[PDB]
Amino acid sequence: FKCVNSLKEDHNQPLFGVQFNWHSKEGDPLVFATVGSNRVTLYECHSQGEIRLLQSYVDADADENFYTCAWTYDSNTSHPLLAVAGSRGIIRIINPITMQCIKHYVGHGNAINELKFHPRDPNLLLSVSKDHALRLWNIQTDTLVAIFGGVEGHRDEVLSADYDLLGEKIMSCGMDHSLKLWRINSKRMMNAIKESYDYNPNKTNRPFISQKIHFPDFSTRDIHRNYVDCVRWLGDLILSKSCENAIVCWKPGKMEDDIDKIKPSESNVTILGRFDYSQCDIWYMRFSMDFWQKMLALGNQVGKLYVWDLEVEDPHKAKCTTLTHHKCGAAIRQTSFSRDSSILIAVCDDASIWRWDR
Ligand SMILES: Cc1cccc(F)c1CN1C[C@H](c2ccc(-c3cnn(CC(N)=O)c3)cc2)[C@@H](N(C)C)C1
């Protein structure tokens, strides 16, 4: 990787999120979105390092702070869609062509810290909230499918979550130091999703009933000792970090325990490795993976990038490379790989954007 360009957005506030559109059509240039201040902005990557500015969506409320975005597509038309959310607790579905807000969703109106789309169903959107809950939405029928919370749910802000490969289960994490597993391939949850697709408010009198899921299928506070701010599945294993200069690779149960036989009472975890780094001990810093999950990237609070090659026989054998540029000194909140892995974008607390090309 070599650094080929940078720019800075005019708001001078942190960019909290960046995502390449992995649903961009064949023959179209690569496009990524950034979120920070009260806006979302799209850029196109071109040759000779050019980052071409397209168009932003700017919230009507100057006090909105967007924290997260996620791409999907319209399941009928195939056209890409961009979901954004933040401090106002409003999910907006944006048409990236025109930057029009097509529609929006509100739960209880508390800050949304992350959005993720289901890996097999482009209509299923997961939000994680300052109010300690996760919410699963069906953006085809505009329904809240389920809320994941309760006293055995998270007891402080949820900061991150991730679906596994097939979208059979979710791992969430947050300010309570815990990582929690929620299965969504239960008979109850599969039925709820089916019913969400059968719901049309114009053809019935009932409101749509959301599931209240009050018990995770596994919980641990034994991995980290501070706010857990990013989580990703790596097959049946988990990658997660806190502010302790480490990403931990771990699994529920003992070494030979199958993830789908784990009981909610399981008290053990197994640590398969840990990737240490420096100067990333402030709260709220995300790591990202490429499409194939061959690579892992994390930026630190002084503008250094760490990239791990996970194409090795066991997690602890990961090979680290580091990327620095003398002008890049601000905290990197998130990174994104292009779908082909040829470009890595980093975004920063000073509103700067850094492009690295293979
Ligand atoms: C990015 C991220 C990463 C991982 C998990 C996550 F959940 C999030 C999302 N975060 C948005 C919120 C937030 C974070 C930072 C600031 C802030 C203010 N000033 N600065 C530095 C400056 N230089 O201005 C930074 C303000 C609000 C955090 N919540 C819990 C308070 C969660």
Give dist(CA 152, CA 260) in Å, integer. Answer: 20
Helix (H) / strand (E) containing 334: strand 332-337
Distance 216 CA to ligand 1 centre (A): 26
Number of domains in the chain: 1
Residue-number span of the structural domain to which 102 is assigned = 1-358
The CATH number of the domain holding residue 1 is: 2.130.10.10
Q: Which residue has its alpha carbon closest to ligand 1 atom 2?
A: 284
DSSP-derived letter for residue 196 is H
- CB contact at 8 A, 175 and 227: yes
Q: Which residue has its alpha carbon closest to ligand 1 atom 29?
A: 113
Task: Extract the tokens encoding 30.
Answer: 């690569």
The Cα angle at residue 300 between residues 295 and 303, in degrees rounded to 5: 105
Give dist(CA 272, CA 177) in Å, integer. Answer: 19
Helix (H) / strand (E) containing 34: strand 30-36
Distance 150 CA to ligand 1 centre (A): 25
Residues 6+ apart with CB under 8 A from 77: none
Which residues are paired to 295 by β-bridges? 309
Query: Of 61, 184, 200, 55, whose CA–CA distance to 125 is shortest?
Result: 184
Distance 267 CA to ligand 1 centre (A): 31
Distance 339 CA to ligand 1 centre (A): 26
The Cα angle at residue 112 between residues 111 and 115, in degrees rounded to 5: 175
Give dist(CA 232, CA 175) in Å, integer. Answer: 16
Give dist(CA 330, CA 210) in Å, integer. Answer: 42
Sheet with 237-241, side-by-side order of all strands = 230-234, 237-241, 246-252, 269-276
Give dist(CA 128, CA 173) in Å, integer. Answer: 9
Query: What's at 218, amino acid-wise?
Result: F
Instruction: Count the residues in the chain.
Output: 358
Q: Which residue has its alpha carbon closest to ligand 1 atom 26?
A: 14
Elucidated via: X-ray
- CB contact at 8 A, 146 and 192: yes
Task: Extract the tokens encoding 56.
Answer: 């932003």
DSSP string, 74-140: -TTT--EEEEEEETT-EEEEEETTTTEEEEEEESSS--EEEEEE-SS-TTEEEEEETTS-EEEEETT
Strands 319-323 and 66-73 turn out to be unpaired
Q: 265: exposed, middle or buried (C-beta count within 10 Å: 0-12, 13-18, 19+)?
A: exposed
The resolution in angstroms reads: 1.6
Q: Which residue has its alpha carbon closest to ligand 1 atom 13?
A: 284
Question: How many CB atoms sit inside 10 A of residue 296's CB?
Answer: 24
Strands 30-36 and 15-20 turn out to be antiparallel
Cα dihedral value 276, 284, 231, 263, nearest 10:
110
